[PDB]
Nucleic acid binder design. Structure first.
Ligand code: NA
Length: 291
DNA sequence: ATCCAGGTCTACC
DNA sequence: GGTAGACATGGA
């Protein structure tokens, strides 16, 4: 557990003595799309049909708009607070080549996000830029999500499966998924009619989970790894996108090695900590725009 | 401009 | 089971 205790306030909860927890590292490392940095350094996000604001002050984290019951049943796990990241970093740091990346993203934690939202979010991520991905996800939410109110503004929850099933390919194109619109529609249809079951897929071991996810149109090896890592906690995942590819070619492999070979290399070397190693590498590579 | 961005699908061998 | 071209969008 990377925290001591919690104090329930009137309109917030204070998590005391949190370790390995930095807002920029967590919300900007590439894993999430609905968290927005505020002028004061706080971040406001929309997840699980709730609007939450997070502030870090010294060794404490203040989570606004939630109570103690919600922290225990939803948010403590959302921020993966029961895992000791000190041990993860210690193990990974034994590899000198990973040290600089780990040091750069010491406050990273892998959030435990919703499978349905993550599935669609990363289908949208294919050959796309994060700012555009965020816009598309927010548009989809504004178009059919439930209204949430927080500090004078109305936010929109991610749509339910039933509401998203009402989308036509054109609707997705309007939220602008581009050519990915057909993939989103086909995928929502398969979820709606029960062809593929996310709860069942999430219960499968890492390799089997990966294989089932690729059955979805628009989901390949990279998107499947992102989905199982970010919403199913399958930590042997090693999503190789353009940035992780660059990071690996700088440290472990030659420039002509295929993405499949890079994925296999990483999973063999990092094992059960592959997903974590991947995040530190991605964050360092993208933030420092390595060439 | 050509390329790139959290790649995948298709066609092909 | 391993590789070229197509596929939208917008920033640089
Ligand atoms: Na697929």
């Amino acid at each position: 557990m990377d925290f001591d205790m919690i104090e329930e306030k009137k309109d917030s909860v204070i998590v005391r003595n949190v370790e390995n927890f930095e807002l920029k590292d967590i919300f900007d490392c590439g894993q999430c799309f609905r968290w927005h940095r505020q002028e004061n350094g706080n971040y406001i996000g929309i997840a699980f049909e709730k609007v939450v604001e997070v502030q870090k002050i010294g060794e404490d984290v203040v989570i606004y708009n939630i109570n103690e019951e919600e922290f225990k049943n939803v948010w403590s796990e959302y921020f993966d607070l029961y895992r000791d990241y000190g041990e993860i970093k210690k193990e990974l740091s034994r590899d000198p080549l990973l040290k600089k990346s780990v040091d750069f993203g010491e406050g990273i934690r892998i959030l435990r996000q919703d499978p349905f939202e993550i599935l669609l979010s990363f289908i949208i991520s294919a050959n796309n830029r994060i700012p555009m991905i965020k816009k598309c996800i927010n548009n989809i939410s504004e178009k059919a999500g439930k209204k949430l109110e927080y500090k004078g503004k109305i936010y929109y929850a991610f749509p339910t499966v039933d509401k998203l099933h009402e989308f036509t390919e054109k609707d997705f194109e309007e939220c602008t998924a581009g050519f990915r619109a057909k993939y989103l529609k086909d995928t929502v249809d398969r979820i709606y009619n029960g062809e593929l079951n996310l709860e069942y897929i999430k219960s499968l071991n890492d390799n089997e989970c990966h294989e089932e996810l690729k059955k979805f149109m628009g989901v390949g090896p990279q998107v499947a790894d992102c989905i199982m890592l970010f919403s199913m906690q399958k930590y042997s995942a090693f999503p190789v996108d353009t940035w992780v590819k660059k990071a690996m070619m700088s440290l472990y492999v030659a420039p002509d090695v295929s993405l499949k070979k890079i994925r296999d290399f990483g999973r063999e070397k990092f094992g059960s900590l592959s997903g974590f190693a991947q995040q530190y590498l991605f964050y360092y590579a993208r933030e420092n725009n390595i060439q």
